[PDB]
Design a protein around this ligand. Sequence first.
Ligand SMILES: N#Cc1ccccc1-c1cc(-c2ccccn2)cn(-c2ccccc2)c1=O
Lengths: 44, 86, 35
Amino acid sequence: GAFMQQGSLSGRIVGGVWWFFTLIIISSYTANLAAFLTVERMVS
Amino acid sequence: PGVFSFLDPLAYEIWMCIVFAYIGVSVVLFLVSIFNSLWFSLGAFMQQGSLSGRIVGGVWWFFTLIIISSYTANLAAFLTVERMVS
Amino acid sequence: EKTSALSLSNVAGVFYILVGGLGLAMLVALIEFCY
Ligand SMILES: N#Cc1ccccc1-c1cc(-c2ccccn2)cn(-c2ccccc2)c1=O
């Protein structure tokens, strides 16, 4: 229930670093997907 | 690859600049409202961002919106350049 | 096609609109501490 909503001082830093971690993956997933749509590669 | 390659589409000076805005907003929530206040502030930090405290999260939400957009845009520019490329 | 750099000369435009919101927050924090 705290994972779907992104991410107590000890429990606060858990949901904050996890929020930055999942932020980069979803930003790298969208960026790498957008580059193929531009240059359609052909695999031999 | 590498860990120094884990600081590229945002400048070497921007990764050390975003941290100044993180501690700068958590100290305003200290003044508009210590172990539980810092727990509330980034409890409010990852959930995007009183009338004095509402405008803190409203403006911080737009600031972090551009950086995460300027990160995804610059990262895709390299992957397109590292695409064709011959 | 090498850079493909990410000139923070204009990333400062995002930081200049945030600190103004923190200063605007300190003015409302004083009218709430008095009213
Ligand atoms: N260098 C590198 C590299 C190699 C393989 C896959 C990705 C990268 C790469 C990673 C990153 C990066 C940096 C910080 C956080 C996450 N990723 C950046 N770049 C990159 C992007 C634009 C210009 C130059 C390097 C990259 O080329």
